Structures are given as structure tokens and as C-alpha cells.
Amino acid sequence: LSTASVLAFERKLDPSDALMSAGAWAQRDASQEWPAVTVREKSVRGTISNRLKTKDRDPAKLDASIQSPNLQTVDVANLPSDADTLKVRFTLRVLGGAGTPSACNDAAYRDKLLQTVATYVNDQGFAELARRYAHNLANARFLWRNRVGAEAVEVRINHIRQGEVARAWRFDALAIGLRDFKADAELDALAELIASGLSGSGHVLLEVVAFARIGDGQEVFPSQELILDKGDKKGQKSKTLYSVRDAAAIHSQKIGNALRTIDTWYPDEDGLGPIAVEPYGSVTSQGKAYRQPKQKLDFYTLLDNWVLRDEAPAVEQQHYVIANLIRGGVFGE
Amino acid sequence: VRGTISNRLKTKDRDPAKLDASIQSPNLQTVDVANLPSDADTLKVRFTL
Amino acid sequence: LSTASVLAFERKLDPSDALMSAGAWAQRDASQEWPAVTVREKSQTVDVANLPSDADTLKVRFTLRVLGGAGTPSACNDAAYRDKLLQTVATYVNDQGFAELARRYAHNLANARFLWRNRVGAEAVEVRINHIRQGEVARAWRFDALAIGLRDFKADAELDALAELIASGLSGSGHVLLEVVAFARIGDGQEVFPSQELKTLYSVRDAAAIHSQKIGNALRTIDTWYPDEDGLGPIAVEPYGSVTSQGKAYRQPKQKLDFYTLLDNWVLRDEAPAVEQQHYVIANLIRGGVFGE
Amino acid sequence: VAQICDEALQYAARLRELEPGWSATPGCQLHDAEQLWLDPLRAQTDETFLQRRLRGDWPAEVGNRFANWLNRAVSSDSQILGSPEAAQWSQELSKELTMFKEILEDERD
Amino acid sequence: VTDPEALLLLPRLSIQNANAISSPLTWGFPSPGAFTGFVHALQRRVGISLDIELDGVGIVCHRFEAQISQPAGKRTKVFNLTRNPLNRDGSTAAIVEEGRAHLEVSLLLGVHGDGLDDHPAQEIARQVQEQAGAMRLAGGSILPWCNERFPAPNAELLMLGGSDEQRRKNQRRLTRRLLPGFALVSREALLQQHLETLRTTLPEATTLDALLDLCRINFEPWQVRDKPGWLVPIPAGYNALSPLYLPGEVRNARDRETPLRFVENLFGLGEWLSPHRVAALSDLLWYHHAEPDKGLYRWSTPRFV
RNA sequence: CUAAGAAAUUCACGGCGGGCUUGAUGUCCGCGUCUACCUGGUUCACUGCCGUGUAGGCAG
């Protein structure tokens, strides 16, 4: 038995584009029509700080490093000085029916994959994936950068099915540790909601509102869009902050990778901080290729053993297998 | 989008030199995406038949 | 044992923009809701405004915090080079604290070097500082930049107290948030000074302001270590850093006053340099910036 | 490879110098790479303190872009990527990029 | 063969009505023997009042616009001609077929002699240009210069004095004075390589001159043979057959103070590189050797590779 | 000292009439873009009375 030529799945835990708003004090009890953080631009004088060749024998670089400097534009999305809470608001849905392939080809591979993932789901539930997804939602790991140096990263996740709110979650992300796979009470209530949404026994719409307390006009950093070889230095060549209509914003694939940590059995040291789940589990944030195909921590080896060759891996490896059967992705040759 | 090599790479050539050459400087491209506005929640699809 | 590819070190002491507003003489005990600076036009187009003919004290309004955590590079690749860098930073942390750098940053926050041209003209440059963890006052401070010199390294008892509280914010186990409110007595009918774009001025919502990178380079004015003539005192700190308004290169690569020789001998060869060169290393690692080719 | 790169350099030098006037203008995204290499001498009515934007504009952006375009269009062996033919082709591509940079980096000097 | 001290230059010699026949079996470019004859004629009308000599010559061939037409959609190309005056009866003339082309080319001269320091550089370059402007080049005239004004100077250098990087600086001046040109040097190396790779059948050089300027098509081991450069069959001198007659013996000669020999012309092999391939610009010169007893007159490109 | 030296192709003309291109279709999945940088520029050999001459004791 072998795989199919093209496998694919869909983006379960599908997030949206964030809406970084801000406002004055004590209106965050009922923060509805606060103004947002935009993308505004300002100049900068680029005097070079990059590394230079040793034994600088030529004073021509001594001259031209400073005598002919650069002048470019860097956009900076500071908050207003009258406001302190980076209200990162977005939404997040959960499809469910994870092992159902979006576009498979081979029926026998599909049969073994369906019965194997159903064996998982009705044997050992989605509560571990739910607890770690509710932890990654409980802190602000979806904020890749804005978590460092804060007062009270105060999340308010809410559950909406019809046009009304249900209850009020009030957290921190300093009392909640960054790396702890613990099990609280109300966090396991919200994790029970995520478990009900994930396993296919219903449907869930989770919007996530993190009150990042960064400061009275302190600089935040949304994502940077690319640029090509058709624009000069003047014309925002260096940095362009991602935006929506008169507001700055955060990408969907970026939050949607920063809410999917299950893999804390990469071989080197989980104590050095967890990672983001991918097949050939790699972190371009640190550029290093964990889970070599030389080893047997390759996901494609894991799925080809847990489906094809009928040799099941460790339970923690199976949590990882369904983490990147539930993140989506292209598969197959 | 800043990607990462993530398809089934053929494991007849698994060298850390070229694997890290992929992962240090990955592919990066422009992909267009249609989303809703901020306030709205529905999706009016209209055609005629 | 070789160099890592891309080195990312984020900007500690991360600043913000500097608002402007105008008040009068002896009316400054309630500096909370002064009228700001609007953008005027007179007859290239020189759209540079002036202070009104009644108010003269320019309240310059900006804040500052410290991120901290310089022991980990924000992007690296190697494992053994990273272990060498971590044990070298741990050697410094077990060696000495942030007292000297906090007192030098107090020397920056004692004079009016952050105002590059706004210092000349003012009469009594008073620096009002409150203490903020929430939206109230906890401790206050008043300075004067005419009794406090510009180039001379002196640390008074009040400057030692404020630098010690900043260093308590700096050590990585306690958070501080201290703003600066300055009084530029420019006059009744004299020029306002925002930052300039690439006239091409800068402005904010129903007011005017000054950029943040100029404050971020002004507060790191430490460099008295360039070998030609140190009768000018502290200048801006970068690797291959100098002042760009004179036109002269400081911290030459022909001598050993460069950051890169220090880093190579300090990490790779274990030829560890002296204390003040490590102060320069940690100063231009605490300013932030890109490193690695 | 190096022969086609040198012939393309000579032909692009002989063909890009048809008009006697060109400067920074709209649609000049090639001018960040070919403003001095794949372009002739500009006009002579601007300020005299501008000899460092073309005299210093070496063949690292234009020649590096040409080498990257050659390495992005043409490639090497993908199943034999540890063999010596792809290494000789990579060394030839690097030498062609360095030769194009040394030949076209003096477009102001 | 004497290594020059200077590289005199004439940057754009636009010629008109050149003789593009050059041989009984080529037709494209005027033969390099004509260029060496032009340099020797410059040496005879300049280098007698200057105490120098001129032997080297460069070829760059900026553009080559010929005067051809093809007949009736065929893949051959006939030459177009000129009419001729009438006879005594006035009917029509015996029109013989001669080709015609239009060129420009620069000449990298080489000043071997000692009269380089008794005169400044611009004076000798200016009077060599003033003499070269009034001389037929290869059966055709040289066009003068109008009011476009830019290549009107005529450069020179000094090979005897300077460093290695300074000679590279003079090379970077010259090879940017010649940017679109295509050089021309003859190869015995590649041609003997083709002899000693086709050598199993027969060493006849004519079949492998014919089988080298060709788009050759072979079968499975569509395929066209490739090459790094652009190749050309050019006449590489003269292969005199007669015993050398005394001056008064041969009737109807040009003059009666120099001897005559009857000749079939040789064939070698030439190519077309850009000037930026080969480094030293003393490698792009056409010296010509000659010997009295051996009836072999030749237009070599020595010191090249 | 150049496969050297030489050269009048001219004359005139009606391309022109006609046309149905046609039916049908799923583009399907997915991703970490980042650390950075002084404008007070040397701002392109500058404004307000009694003399449309190289004349101006300036809240510039």
C-alpha cells in the first residue's frame, strides 16, 4: 500500500485579519467604537551600520560611508499618546471533521486514514490539542512580537453563535505562563468549547480580543509586506506596514501559525521554548532544521508509519500528527 | 507570504547544507485574499440563472 | 566555531514621538491641557509655524520604556556559538550591573542634548518627570539644565536617585515607565521645531510632533572614545558611528575602537577586552539594530 | 555560460546607449540596477555634486540581479546536486556575475 | 614583431563603398591584409617626418551594413551592381560583378619607434588622423566627420611607462571607447584542433574550412552544433606559385623596379570576440610576416594565446 | 603603397470580387518576513524705508 499523488486538507483553526485599535481608560469595559492604529509614514537618515571588511586599507569607504549617506522612508505605527491598550481584535473559526481529506486520490489510503484518525478521535479525545490551543489563545503567542515588555496582556475571548455575547473572560498573560501545559478551570471550560468545535460535534465561532498593555503611545509592529525591483529608495522601499482600510493589521497565515503549537517533542530541548508545527519541523525564526528526515521525527515518516506501514508511533507523536493534519497543507508527491 | 519548503521532499538527497539553504532564505511571494469588512458578518452571493 | 548568518537585536530603550504645546511664564503649575502647536503657512513653500505672541514655554511631551532581555539574539542559527554568547553575557551579568550605563543615560537626561536646536533660546530648561505604572503620579522630579553641564560627566544625588530607579527598571526584574516634559522658552513669536521629512515637516492629530529615532539616537550620546580630538565630548554611538553634520569618521577600523574586532576577540578567540570596551559593546547592543553581514 | 554572459554584456552596452539623454524618471525601476551599467551617459545640466551616485554605483545590484536572473531561469542538476558539474556551473555563474560587475561597475568613473 | 610603446587610436572610421568580395570564396568583410596595407601606407605618409613606424592594427567592426539582395525568395544572395559607360558604338558594357558594403571600424595602431617623446601625444595623434582622413581604405572611401561632435578626439597612451593597474586603467579607458565592437583575430589553434580531431579520414584543410562555418545537423547518439564564439573564414595571405621574376622580365607590370610573383591566396580561420575577453590590447594586432624564397605571404595575429 | 586604380539601372502600370468559425468546461489545498538607522541638513554664492548705481546703525 502507498499514498496518493495529491493529498490536501483545509485550514482548521482559520483566523482573520486583526484590527489594532486603542483608546482611553476604563472604556475597555464596553470598547465598541474606539479609533484604530493606522499606517503612517516618516523619514529616516540611513547612516550605515552594517558590517565592513577587515583591514580597511582604503579611505574611500571612510569618506563615502558618511560623505554620501542615504535618505529613506520607514513607516512607524505608534499609538496615540492618549491611549494605552493595543486592542488586537480578530476572529477564528473551527471547521471540524479534521481527518476528512479535502482532495484525496487513493481510496484505500483514504480508508486507512479515515479509520485511523477516527480511532484516534473516539479513543483519545481532542482535549490535549484543546488545552494547548486554549493555552496559545490564553497568552498572546499569536502576537509574535508585542508580548515582550507589557503590564497586563488581558485577553477577552468570547463565544458567539447568534447575535449576542455569552459571558466575559478576563485573563492575564503574566499569571498564565508562556510555556506551561497546565489545566485550569475556566481555561478548561473554554478548552471544552474548543474540543466540541474541533471534534465535529458542533460548530464554534471564537473571537479573540487581546488588550496588550504596551504604553501611552508606545511603538507596535504589524507585519511587513514585500516590494519588488520597480521602486526606488524614496517611495517606502524598506518597510511597509500591513494594513486594512485606514487601519494597521496583522496577517492571517501568521496568527494561524502562532496558534498551533503541539510539537514540544522536538529532539534538542523543549526547555528552550516550543516551536510551530510543520512537517519537517522547522523554525525560520531560528533558521534551524529540527526533525531531520535522517531521523524518524519527520512528519511524513510519522504519517507513513501511522497509516501505511501500520506501526503506530508514540501518543505524543500522534498529537503532532493530527496537529499537522489539522493545520492544513499540501501533501503527497 | 514567507513560506517554507513543506511538500514531500524526496529523501534520496537529505543534506543539511541544502536544507538549511532552503530554510535560511525561503521562498516569498504575493498571494491575494478576499476578506469581509470589519463590521459585516454575512456574505451576500447574488447571481442570476 | 564561526559567525552566525543573520543577527537580530531589537531596540531596547524604545522611544516614542515628542509632542509640542505652548504655555506662558508663571502659568505653568497646571501643565496638563495646554494648547498645542498647529501647522501654519507663510510666504518653495515654507510651512513652518511659530509660537503665539503670548505663550512662550514649549512643553515637549514624550515617553520611554525599556524592553530588556539582551542575553538572547532575536535571530540566530548556531548552537555552540549561541552557547558561547550566552555564557559570555552571563559572565557580564555575574560581573557587573547596569549602574554605569544608567548614570550615563542620566547624563543624557540631565542636560538638554535631546533637544538638538531647541536648547538654545530657552531660559530655565526644566525637566518635569512623573512615575507611571498606571494613570496617576507616584513620584515626581524637577530639573534645570543650566545648573547641569553638557559635556562633563557629573552625577548629582538627584541624578543618582533617578538613574538608580531607571537601573531598577533596567535589570530585567522590574518595569519602569518614565516620561520627560521639557520647557523650551522659545519666545512670543518665534519658531517651532518639528522633525523634517525627505518645507517637508511632520505633524500629528490636531497638533505637531517630533520623530522618535532622533530621540533614540540622542539619548545614546555616550561616545567619548574617538582618538582624534575629544574636546567635543559625547557623540552618537553606533558601530562605525559618528556625527554626520560635521563630516568626520569616528571609531576608525584602523585602530581597535570598532565593535567588530571586540566581538570577534570577545566571543571567538577568547581574547577578552577591557571593561570600557565591554561598556561600548553592551551600549551598541542595547541600542538595538541589525548585526551580521 | 561565461561566453553568453559576456556577449550579452557587450550587446546590452552597445544597444542601451542609443539615446543621449536619460535620468531618474517614472518607470525607472531598471535604473536601480541598469542606471549605469545597462544605460548610457546621462545629461550634463544637473548639479556638479552628483558624481558619486553613478561613479560609486558598482555592478553589485545590476550584475547581482543579472546573476540572480540567470540562476533563477537556468538551473543545475537537481537529483545530482552534490556532483561536480553543478559546482562548476555555480562557479561559472559566480565568475560571470563578478566579470559583469567588474566590466559595468565603472559607469560613472 | 617588436613590442609597441604606444596604442594610437582612430575611434570611428566610417567608410563607404568598401570591397566586400575579398577572395574567390568568401564575401563578407574586407580582408585584414587591406587593413595592414592601410597601416603601412599611413607609415609611409606619416612615419617619414616623425621617425616612427606603424605595424599593429585593431579591428572592431561596429556595424556592417552590406549592399545585397536575394533573388526570387531563394536562400542565396546576389550582389547588386553599378552601371558602366558605353563603348564607341554606344550599346552596353560588359558588366562584371563586384560587391560593395558599408562599414565603420576603429584602428588600434602600434607605434614601435622612438619619436614618441620628441612630440606630444595630441600632436602625433592629430596629424595621423589628418593623414588617415584622406586615404582610400579597402577599395572605398573614408567618410569625414559632421557636427555630431563626440568622437572627434583621437586618443593615445604610453605602454613603456606605467604600473600594472595603470595599464589596466588605460585598458578600461580604451575598451569603453570601443564598447559595441567585435574584435577579429585568426586562429591556427582551433583549426589545428579540428585537423587533429577529424584527422582519421584526410588532412585536407578545405573540407574542414567548409565544415566549420556551418549549422551542422546529426542524429541520435533537434541537434545543432554549438560554439562559444562567432567564426569566419577569412583570407590569411598569399601562397605565391611562380619563380620570382626579375623586374624587367614581366610585361605590363605596375612599375619596373620591384619584382612580381603570381599568387593563389591562402585560407585560414578567424573569429569574433568582444574586446573584453582577452585582457592585453597588444594581443589584437595584425602583424604580417613575409619571406623572399618561400612563396608564402601571411597575415598573422601573433602573441595572442 | 590596400583582389589596388574606374563606373547614371532608367522608363510606366487598377489586385478584385464573396463569406455564420462553433458547441461544453471546478483551479484545489498551504505557509513567520524580520532586526535596523539623527535632518538643526553644508538647506542652490537669503527678506523689510528716503537714490529703477557695488547704498542698508538687523523686534533678522
Curated annotation (Swiss-Prot), chain A:
Cited CDD domains: Csy3_I-F (cd09737)
Disruption outcome: Mutants lose phage DMS3 infection-dependent inhibition of biofilm formation while there is normal biofilm formation in the absence of phage infection. Decreased production of crRNA in the presence or absence of phage. Disruption of the entire Y.pestis-subtype CRISPR region disrupts crRNA production but does not alter phage resistance (possibly OLNs PA14_33350 to PA14_33310, and the flanking CRISPR loci), indicating this CRISPR is not involved in phage resistance.
UniProt xrefs under Pfam families: Cas_Csy3
Keywords from the named record: Antiviral defense
Segments traversing the membrane: none
GO terms for biological process, alphabetical: defense response to virus
NCBIfam families: cas_Csy3
Function: CRISPR (clustered regularly interspaced short palindromic repeat) is an adaptive immune system that provides protection against mobile genetic elements (viruses, transposable elements and conjugative plasmids). CRISPR clusters contain sequences complementary to antecedent mobile elements and target invading nucleic acids. CRISPR clusters are transcribed and processed into CRISPR RNA (crRNA). Cas3 and Cascade participate in CRISPR interference, the third stage of CRISPR immunity (Potential). Involved in crRNA production or stability.
Family according to the record: Belongs to the CRISPR-associated Csy3 family.
Remarks, miscellaneous: In this bacteria, Y.pestis-subtype CRISPRs do not confer resistance to phage DMS3 or MP22, but instead are required for DMS3 infection-dependent inhibition of biofilm formation and possibly motility.
Subunit structure: Part of the Csy ribonucleoprotein complex with a probable stoichiometry of Csy1(1),Csy2(1),Csy3(6),Cas6/Csy4(1)-crRNA(1). A Csy3(6),Cas6/Csy4(1)-crRNA(1) subcomplex is also formed.
Protein name (record): CRISPR-associated protein Csy3
Swiss-Prot record, chain D:
Changes seen on gene knockout: Mutants lose phage DMS3 infection-dependent inhibition of biofilm formation while there is normal biofilm formation in the absence of phage infection. Decreased production of crRNA in the presence or absence of phage. Disruption of the entire Y.pestis-subtype CRISPR region disrupts crRNA production but does not alter phage resistance (possibly OLNs PA14_33350 to PA14_33310, and the flanking CRISPR loci), indicating this CRISPR is not involved in phage resistance.
Family classification: Belongs to the CRISPR-associated Csy1 family.
Annotated function: CRISPR (clustered regularly interspaced short palindromic repeat) is an adaptive immune system that provides protection against mobile genetic elements (viruses, transposable elements and conjugative plasmids). CRISPR clusters contain sequences complementary to antecedent mobile elements and target invading nucleic acids. CRISPR clusters are transcribed and processed into CRISPR RNA (crRNA). Cas3 and Cascade participate in CRISPR interference, the third stage of CRISPR immunity (Potential). Involved in crRNA production or stability.
Extra facts: In this bacteria, Y.pestis-subtype CRISPRs do not confer resistance to phage DMS3 or MP22, but instead are required for DMS3 infection-dependent inhibition of biofilm formation and possibly motility.
Subunit structure, interactors included: Interacts directly with Csy2; part of the Csy ribonucleoprotein complex with a probable stoichiometry of Csy1(1),Csy2(1),Csy3(6),Cas6/Csy4(1)-crRNA(1). A Csy3(6),Cas6/Csy4(1)-crRNA(1) subcomplex is also formed.
Designated name of the protein: CRISPR-associated protein Csy1
Lineage start: Bacteria, Pseudomonadati, Pseudomonadota, Gammaproteobacteria, Pseudomonadales
Residues of the full protein shown: 326 to 434 of 434
UniProtKB/Swiss-Prot annotation, chain E:
Disruption phenotype annotation: Mutants lose phage DMS3 infection-dependent inhibition of biofilm formation while there is normal biofilm formation in the absence of phage infection. Loss of production of crRNA in the presence or absence of phage. Disruption of the entire Y.pestis-subtype CRISPR region disrupts crRNA production but does not alter phage resistance (possibly OLNs PA14_33350 to PA14_33310, and the flanking CRISPR loci), indicating this CRISPR is not involved in phage resistance.
Keywords of the record: Antiviral defense
Presence of the UniProt keyword Ligase in the record: no
Biological process annotations from GO: defense response to virus
Matches recorded under CDD domains: Csy2_I-F
InterPro entries referenced in this protein's UniProt entry, alphabetically: CRISPR-assoc_prot_Csy2
Stated role: CRISPR (clustered regularly interspaced short palindromic repeat) is an adaptive immune system that provides protection against mobile genetic elements (viruses, transposable elements and conjugative plasmids). CRISPR clusters contain sequences complementary to antecedent mobile elements and target invading nucleic acids. CRISPR clusters are transcribed and processed into CRISPR RNA (crRNA). Cas3 and Cascade participate in CRISPR interference, the third stage of CRISPR immunity (Potential). Absolutely required for crRNA production or stability.
Family to which this protein belongs: Belongs to the CRISPR-associated Csy2 family.
NCBIfam families on file: cas_Csy2 (TIGR02565)
Note: In this bacteria, Y.pestis-subtype CRISPRs do not confer resistance to phage DMS3 or MP22, but instead are required for DMS3 infection-dependent inhibition of biofilm formation and possibly motility.
Assembly mode: Interacts directly with Csy1; part of the Csy ribonucleoprotein complex with a probable stoichiometry of Csy1(1),Csy2(1),Csy3(6),Cas6/Csy4(1)-crRNA(1). A Csy3(6),Cas6/Csy4(1)-crRNA(1) subcomplex is also formed.
Name of this protein: CRISPR-associated protein Csy2
Gene that specifies this protein: csy2
